[PDB]
Design a protein around this nucleic acid. Structure first.
Ligand code: ZN
Ligand code: ZN
Ligand code: ZN
Lengths: 320, 102, 195, 166, 184, 286
RNA sequence: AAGGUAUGUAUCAAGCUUACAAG
């Protein structure tokens, strides 16, 4: 009887099937290969380490960060991963030798997020000072400094179609940038509390942003308020979206809410436990990433643990 | 039109900004180059990979002494590999703080 | 719009009105506007972006590291300009006054000439887009009283106020507790030795 | 900009930790008019760390439970960093990788803290967990010593007189 | 308030409009800018400021302040105009009974009965929110015995488990008794 | 900090040749006001003339619609404060080194990046012109600007160069009369020159000349044109349009308003595109 | 080589800077 009550599509629920307990420090950002074989994480243990995605073992732990690792991503086009952390350092870990080769420099404060342009070989990084930078890979030269925010810039994603770069910041605003001229195209003032996660879809348009008030959802040319989503009212950290429309929002108090893209229907509302040492008030999700298969949803949490989830093969958890 | 100091306004040719690694390795064909990603299944392949990796792990001498038997070693056995992360109670810190201080 | 936009080049400031924070209606499969551009459009914007930042970084490294042996230019290019200000008997017959513009040689034995050391404060930023939150609420006088913080009753402060009231001196439960304070098995030892 | 070399490692961890807890309380508190009397949650954070190193409990009364448990997770983060650096370069100054005097005199202090708080945890768990020796297990020792001593005819020591000769 | 404290009125207005377009959701800028134009002439500028302030859909506090503005300039026409767009957004029972206001100021006979029709058909069709028909009975008892027997007693299908609490049904009876023709 | 493509350059600085060859640097000197590194340009105006390079940047020329090297108005060929007092508005700019100086130059450059065509604030009041400035806008300019400045060693009589001394000789300058707004020494003399022109003598009576012989009507002035140009002055007592000589006769009641008509029309009232004909009427019952 | 014989103000020239725009 509600507007769009009958038409969400039924997605199956997710369940844990392993946790991975390796770090000594908050596991903080997860990426996963383009070729599905293994995944990778940073920490506040100052150690990146990669893990077999099938059996969960530890392939190797490679280190070199002076302080914590806030972001790690692995390139598709090139055989090397990139890392960034609060030691002001952004590094190009070559994977054929397991060693740093580029070691980008120029951020005046800590470094929060990084992302790769999926078609051309640049790299967009976001900091604490106020700025985001377009590093040119192969030249390690700042093409642009995207100076338009007034506080910390918590996350950044970028794509191939216009608009190119989306920076969600800690001054409660999103803004959408021109990669060529450097000037901002359109800023998006909503979100009484700060935006900390944006994600894009990747079939059709329509990205979505994350904040303690009212996770919203937008539409790429000009920016257009499509919809806001329901009351997941913690200070949320991550957004991830699967190619069949399920969407996970991970938050700082441990609660992670499954959704759907289509309606906005809060689906599962799963809240996990801590592993024995941690106190009760230390559950919180800092990263979540689906597999390339998108059968596995695996989250890096404040309990120094990667939790790996999968589907459930039933039918009778039906939509209300 | 008059950029910052890196562009034209400075002759400070600092080291660490010297043309190192000036060509990019592209991921060639035997690895997971994106042409070999545009069609691959990723789901049945992961499933058979974990279905393969899951099955990998398959008297008259001392009768005057007082304590004639403690009868147990650890009282069951000693194999834990457990992980407390409260770092003062972790077994790594226990062995550290019994090896070095005495 | 002109109050919210002031001076800008018809950007996307049109958010200034109310009617675009209401939720847009429900889209189901409407492929022409909802779906992404095809591969040809994203490849051509890829090529435009790549050649734009390619000439940007080429001029950058031919200015950040330009130290190696390039030719000067060939500035034979004339420039004709109608001096469209004064001409009646100013240079009587100066109808269009074509000039030859060459570029002076720079000797490669000169230091930097100009003191690049200036700092002014950062200027006026982009004038603010409107803000458009939800209607801001105020909670109570009681839950706002719940979200208040006690002062600090530290043992070293070296900050604002060392803050001695009459109470708030023990600053703990009792600064020490052991929840039974003794296990009773002590008794079952002690008299066991005593007898 | 300047890198974080080994002399400002510790003076950068505090900087980024209190930046993180700053724009966590900036985005966590609800729509009240004042945030933290402009600084006070940070004072509670540093006091919580000082009470952690000194093993004083830090039970501040009347504090909102989201900020008190975010202070608990940040001081557990900093205590993990602190003790995991203590282990590390204690092993380095064991086998002798470094000869740094600041590091040696600092890791004597970052490890006396650890011994003394492990020691008051074990003195506290002596009391609530009873004597670790059983009644029979101590009566046996006592009976064995009186048997040994009377088989030795060991005359016990008198309290020394004030007019004791030697 | 600095620019308005002095005689530079054009500049104060010229920064109030950018204050309210930049920050819409804060009530004080709209209030003080309306108040400033109230202390000046009551020009269609002031009404335009107000209808812009209506356009963002605010709370009750602002909307019946604007109807209070229209009453203090004695508008039958315009307070009628701006108060049907009211009720679509606030369906408060306190506001349903005060869209029943042309009765208690103009008496609006046939279309006031239509306002009562609008009151009676909307939400709480069988559940009434226990309050509309109290005030409707108060006006229709202030009216004659036109059709006053129906709504409290004989349109009584729409009860709330007892049709009313104990607080008012004997009061309903003596409410109907002694204000009529009183036939022997 | 600044590149360019072509300079501003009023016409007297280009010289008398339509074919001049000119050279450019990339970051040349600094601006002599704001120390900004523009691109200095150099050329030869004429065969007896110095080179006159380039003095201020393109930004500090676009601010006050000023040429590039001699610092005169691009529309007129006049100094700066002559224009700003003659347009009664100054378009302020600070004096110190930073105090709002490079701040306002940087920001007015940032809001001048779009047009590059017209000055930044003068565009609105450079239209309502041509009345008080057009009387002094010296067309067919004198090229003594471009002559090379006076050498020493002719001043001391020592100049061994003889004839080939390129600079000058036998021009001893006088140390009694030689920045960007105020105050400038010859400008005070030039405003005294405009305030003290040559009118007709004001005859010794008490304002009886309310009539005036204004004519040259031709086919340009009509009756309602001149009496609505005098209706803003005030009221007539008798008009006529005497078309045998193409003339018009107006008076005022108590002269004063038509007094400024005598100030407006000493061969000076230019409406409908004509230098009007003016001489003195009778006011004598003649 | 730094790490020690402090730095911070107020008047008084050469060093360096353009040899210019100009009734
Ligand atoms: Zn200049
Ligand atoms: Zn000139
Ligand atoms: Zn000479």
């Amino acid at each position: 009887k509600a507007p769009t009550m009958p038409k969400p599509q039924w997605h199956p629920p997710w369940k844990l099937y392993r946790v991975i307990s390796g770090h000594l420090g908050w596991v903080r950002c997860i990426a996963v290969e383009p070729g599905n074989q293994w995944f990778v994480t940073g920490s506040a243990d100052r150690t990146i380490k990669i893990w077999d995605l099938a059996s969960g073992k530890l392939k190797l732990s490679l280190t070199g960060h002076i302080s914590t690792v806030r972001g790690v991503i692995v390139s598709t086009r090139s055989p090397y991963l990139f890392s960034c952390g609060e030691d002001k350092q952004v590094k190009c870990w070559d994977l054929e030798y397991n060693k740093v080769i580029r070691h980008y420099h120029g951020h005046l404060s800590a470094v929060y997020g990084l992302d790769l342009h999926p078609t051309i070989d640049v790299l967009v990084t976001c900091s604490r000072d106020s700025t985001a930078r377009i590093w040119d890979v192969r030249t390690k030269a700042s093409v642009h400094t995207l100076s338009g925010h007034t506080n910390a810039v918590a996350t950044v994603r970028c794509q191939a179609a216009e608009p190119q770069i989306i920076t969600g910041s800690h001054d409660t605003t999103i803004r959408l940038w021109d990669l060529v001229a450097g000037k901002t195209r359109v800023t998006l003032t909503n979100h009484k509390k700060s935006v900390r996660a944006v994600v894009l879809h990747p079939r059709h348009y329509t990205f979505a942003s994350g904040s303690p008030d009212n996770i919203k959802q937008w539409k790429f040319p000009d920016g257009s308020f499509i919809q806001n989503l329901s009351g997941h009212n913690a200070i949320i950290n991550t957004l991830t979206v699967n190619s069949d429309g399920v969407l996970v929002s991970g938050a700082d108090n441990g609660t992670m809410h499954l959704w759907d893209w289509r309606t906005g229907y809060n689906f599962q509302r799963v809240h996990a436990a801590v592993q024995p040492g941690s106190l009760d008030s230390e559950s919180g999700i800092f990263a979540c990433a689906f597999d390339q298969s998108e059968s596995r949803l695996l989250t890096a949490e404040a309990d120094k643990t990667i939790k790996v989830y999968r589907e459930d093969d039933t039918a009778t958890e039906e939509t209300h | 039109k008059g950029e910052g100091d890196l562009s034209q306004l400075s002759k400070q040719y600092s080291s660490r900004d010297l043309p190192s690694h000036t060509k990019i390795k592209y991921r060639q064909t035997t690895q997971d180059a994106p042409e070999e990603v545009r069609n691959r299944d990723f789901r049945r392949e992961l499933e058979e990979r974990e279905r393969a990796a899951a099955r990998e792990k398959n008297r008259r001498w001392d009768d005057d002494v007082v304590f004639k038997n403690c009868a147990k070693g650890v009282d069951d056995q000693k194999k834990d590999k457990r992980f407390v992360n409260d770092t003062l109670r972790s077994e790594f810190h226990k062995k550290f703080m019994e090896k070095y201080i005495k | 719009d002109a109050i919210a936009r002031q001076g800008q080049s018809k950007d996307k400031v049109i958010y200034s009105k109310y009617t675009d924070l209401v939720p847009k209606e429900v889209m189901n499969a409407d492929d022409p506007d909802l779906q992404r551009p095809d591969e040809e459009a994203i490849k051509e914007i890829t090529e435009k972006t790549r050649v734009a930042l390619e000439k940007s970084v080429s001029q950058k490294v031919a200015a950040a590291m330009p130290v190696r042996a390039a030719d000067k230019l060939a500035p034979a290019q004339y420039i004709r300009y109608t001096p469209s200000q004064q001409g009646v008997a100013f240079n009587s017959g100066a109808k269009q006054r074509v000039i030859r513009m060459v570029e002076m040689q720079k000797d490669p034995m000169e230091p930097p000439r100009f003191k690049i050391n200036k700092k002014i404060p950062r200027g006026p930023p982009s004038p603010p887009a409107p803000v458009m939150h939800s209607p801001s609420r105020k909670m109570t006088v009681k839950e706002q009283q719940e979200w208040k913080i006690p002062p600090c009753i530290s043992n070293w402060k070296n900050a604002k106020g060392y803050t001695i009231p009459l109470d708030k001196r023990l600053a703990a439960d009792g600064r020490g507790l052991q929840t039974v304070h003794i296990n009773e098995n002590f008794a079952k030892l002690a008299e066991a030795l005593y007898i | 900009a300047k890198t974080v070399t080994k002399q400002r490692v510790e003076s950068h961890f505090d900087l980024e930790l209190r930046a993180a807890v700053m724009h966590d309380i900036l985005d966590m508190m609800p729509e009240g008019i004042k945030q933290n009397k402009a600084r006070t949650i940070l004072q509670h954070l540093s006091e919580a760390w000082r009470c952690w190193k000194a093993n004083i409990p830090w039970k501040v009364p009347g504090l909102p439970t989201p900020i008190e448990n975010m202070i608990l997770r940040y001081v557990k983060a900093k205590a993990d960093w602190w003790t995991n650096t203590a282990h590390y370069n204690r092993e380095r100054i064991r086998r002798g990788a470094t000869v740094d005097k600041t590091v040696c005199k600092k890791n004597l202090g970052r490890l006396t803290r650890l011994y003394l708080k492990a020691e008051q945890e074990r003195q506290h768990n002596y009391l609530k967990d009873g004597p670790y020796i059983t009644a029979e297990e101590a009566v046996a020792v006592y009976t064995t010593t009186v048997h040994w001593l009377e088989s030795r005819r060991f005359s016990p020591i008198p309290f020394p007189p004030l007019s004791y000769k030697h | 308030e600095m620019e308005m404290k002095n005689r530079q009125v054009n500049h104060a207005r010229n920064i109030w409009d950018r204050a309210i377009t930049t920050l819409p959701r804060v009530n004080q800028f709209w209030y003080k800018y309306t108040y400033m134009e109230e202390m000046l002439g009551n020009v269609a500028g002031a009404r335009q400021v107000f209808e812009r302030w209506m356009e963002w859909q605010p709370e009750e506090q602002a909307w019946h302040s604007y109807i209070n503005f229209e009453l203090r300039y004695k508008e039958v026409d315009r307070a009628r105009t701006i108060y049907e767009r009211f009720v679509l957004v606030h369906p408060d029972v306190k506001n349903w009974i005060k869209y029943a206001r042309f009765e208690e100021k103009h008496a609006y006979f046939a279309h006031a009965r239509k306002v009562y029709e609008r009151a009676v058909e909307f939400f709480g069709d069988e559940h009434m929110d226990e309050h509309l028909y109290v005030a409707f009975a108060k006006f229709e008892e202030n009216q004659k015995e036109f059709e006053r027997v129906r709504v409290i007693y004989k349109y009584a299908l729409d009860r709330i488990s007892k049709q009313d609490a104990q607080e008012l049904f004997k009061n309903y009876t003596i409410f109907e008794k002694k204000f009529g023709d009183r036939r022997g | 900090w600044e590149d360019a493509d072509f300079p501003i350059l009023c016409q007297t600085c280009l010289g008398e040749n339509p074919y001049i060859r000119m050279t450019k640097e990339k970051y040349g000197k600094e601006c002599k006001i704001c120390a900004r590194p523009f691109t200095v340009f150099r050329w030869c105006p004429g065969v007896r003339m110095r080179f006159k390079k380039t003095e201020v940047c393109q930004t500090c020329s676009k601010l006050k619609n000023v040429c590039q090297t001699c610092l005169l108005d691009l529309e007129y060929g006049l100094p700066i404060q002559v224009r700003d007092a003659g347009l009664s508005f100054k378009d302020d700019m600070p004096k110190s080194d930073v105090n709002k100086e490079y701040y306002t130059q940087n920001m007015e450059r940032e809001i001048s990046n779009s047009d590059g065509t017209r000055p930044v604030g003068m565009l609105g009041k450079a239209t309502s012109t041509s009345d008080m400035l057009l009387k002094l806008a010296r067309t067919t300019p004198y090229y003594k600007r471009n002559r090379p400045h006076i050498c020493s060693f002719w001043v001391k009589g020592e100049c061994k160069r003889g004839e080939e001394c390129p600079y000058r000789h036998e021009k001893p300058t006088d140390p009694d009369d030689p920045r960007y707004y105020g105050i400038n020494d010859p400008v005070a003399d030039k405003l005294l020159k405009r305030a003290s022109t040559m009118p007709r003598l004001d005859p010794p009576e008490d304002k009886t000349i309310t009539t005036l012989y204004v004519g040259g009507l031709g086919d340009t002035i009509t009756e309602t044109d001149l009496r609505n140009h005098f209706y803003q002055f005030g009221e007539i007592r008798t008009i006529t349009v005497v078309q045998r000589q193409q003339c018009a006769f107006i008076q005022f009641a108590t002269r004063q308003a038509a007094e400024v008509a005598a100030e407006k029309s000493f061969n000076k009232l230019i409406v409908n595109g004509r230098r009007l004909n003016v001489k003195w009427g009778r006011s004598q019952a003649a």
